[PDB]
Amino acid sequence: FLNCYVSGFHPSDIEVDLLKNGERIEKVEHSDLSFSKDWSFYLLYYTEFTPTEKDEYACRVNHV
Amino acid sequence: FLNCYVSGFHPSDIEVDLLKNGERIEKVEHSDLSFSKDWSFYLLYYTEFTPTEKDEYACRVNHV
Amino acid sequence: FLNCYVSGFHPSDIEVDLLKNGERIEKVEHSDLSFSKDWSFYLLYYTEFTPTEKDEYACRVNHV
Amino acid sequence: FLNCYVSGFHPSDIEVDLLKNGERIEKVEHSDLSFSKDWSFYLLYYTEFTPTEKDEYACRVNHV
Amino acid sequence: FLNCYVSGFHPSDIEVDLLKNGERIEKVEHSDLSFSKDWSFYLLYYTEFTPTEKDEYACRVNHV
Amino acid sequence: FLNCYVSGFHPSDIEVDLLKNGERIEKVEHSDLSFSKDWSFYLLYYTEFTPTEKDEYACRVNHV
Amino acid sequence: FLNCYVSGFHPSDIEVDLLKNGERIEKVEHSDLSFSKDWSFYLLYYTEFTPTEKDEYACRVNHV
Amino acid sequence: FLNCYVSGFHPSDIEVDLLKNGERIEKVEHSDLSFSKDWSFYLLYYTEFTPTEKDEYACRVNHV
């Protein structure tokens, strides 16, 4: 068995995922492929954060 | 068995997912493919956050 | 068994993922491929953070 | 068994991941591939941080 | 006389006027006067301008 | 007389005026006066300008 | 007389005026006056300018 | 007379004026006056300028 188990929990996060699984090119001829001519990425532009308040875990296990 | 199990819970998050599973090109001839001519991405533009309030977990397991 | 287990939990983070799984090129002829003509990345531009408040874990295991 | 186990938890971090798994080129002829014509990366531009508040762990194990 | 006279014309401006003519206190006893307990002033908060287009004057005077 | 006269014209400006004419205190007893307990002034907070386009004057005077 | 006269014109400026005419205190007893308990002044906070475009004057006077 | 006269014109400036005309204290008893308990001044905080474009004057006077 197993008691008081956590698998990874995100409080208060922001996650960004992009081309996660690994792009593959095979057997192409006389081609130009580009992923981007113009790409823009901006995660925080002129920004203020304000706090993320307290994130708590309490476990008790007795007498197993 | 298993008692007081968590699998990963997100409080107060924002998740962004883009091209997660891994794009594949096979057997192309005399082509231009582009993912983007003009792409714009902006996650937070001129922004203020205000707090995310407390996110709590309480478990008790007794006598298993 | 196993008691009071944590697998890695992120409080208060931001995660950025890009081309995670390892792009592969095989068997191409007479091609120009580029990942980027113009790429822009900016994680924090002109930004202020404000705190992330306390992130707590309390476990007790007795009498196993 | 195992008691009061942690696997690595990130409080208050930012993680950036880019080309993690190791790109591979095999069997190409008469090609120019470039990863970047113009790439921009900027992690913190003109920025102020404000603190990350206290991140605590308390475990007690008795009588196993 | 006078020909082709201008007195000062504002194109495209914003003017702010506050306590212009000079406040005066005379003959007071046992008083607290304050102009402000809490005052807020913010001229441009998180703002973008866009241009003010061309502002032209043409005068001709002949044979006076 | 006078020909093709300008008195000072502001294009594209912002003017701020505050306590212009010179405040005067006379004959006070047993007083606290303050102009400000808390004052806030912010002229441009987190701001972008965009251009002010061309501001032209053309005068011609002939044969006076 | 006088021809093609300018008195000072501001293009593209910002002017700030504060306590211009010279404050005067006369004949006070047993007083605390302060101009400021807390004063805040910030002219440009985290700001970008963009150009002010060309500001032109052309005069011609002939045969006076 | 006088021809093609300029009095001083400011293009593209910012002017700041503070206590210009010369403050005067006369005949006070048993007083604390302060101009500032806390004063803040910040002219440019974390700022980028971008150019001010060309500012031109052309005069011609003939045959006076």
Author numbering:
A (entry chain G), B (entry chain H), C (entry chain F), D (entry chain E), E (entry chain D), F (entry chain C), ...: 22 to 85
Provide passages from the article that reported this PDB entry.
Each layer is related by a twist of −0.608° and rise of 4.83 Å, giving the fibril a left-handed twist, which was verified using scanning electron microscopy (SEM). The subunits in each protofilament have an identical conformation that is related by a 180° rotation along the fibril long axis (C2 symmetry). The β2m subunits have an ordered, L-shaped core formed by residues 22–85. By contrast, each β2m molecule in the fibril has six β-strands (strands 1–6) which are stacked parallel and in-register in the fibril core, consistent with previous MAS-NMR31 and EPR35 data. The N-terminal 22 residues and C-terminal 14 residues are disordered in the cryo-EM structure, and β-strands A and G in the native structure which lie in these regions are not seen at high resolution in the cryo-EM structure. Finally, each subunit is stabilised by an unusual face-to-face, three-ring π-stack (Tyr63, Tyr66, and Tyr67) perpendicular to the fibril axis which kinks the polypeptide backbone in the region where the protofilaments meet. This perpendicular π-stacking not only stabilises each subunit, but provides additional stabilising interactions between protofilaments, which associate via the heels of two subunits, forming an interface that is unlike that seen for any other amyloid fibril to date.
In its native, functional state, β2m forms a canonical, seven β-stranded immunoglobulin fold that chaperones the folding and assembly of class 1 major histocompatibility complex (MHC-1). Following dissociation from MHC-1, β2m is normally cleared by the kidneys, but in patients with impaired kidney function who are undergoing long-term haemodialysis, serum levels of β2m rise as much as 40-fold.
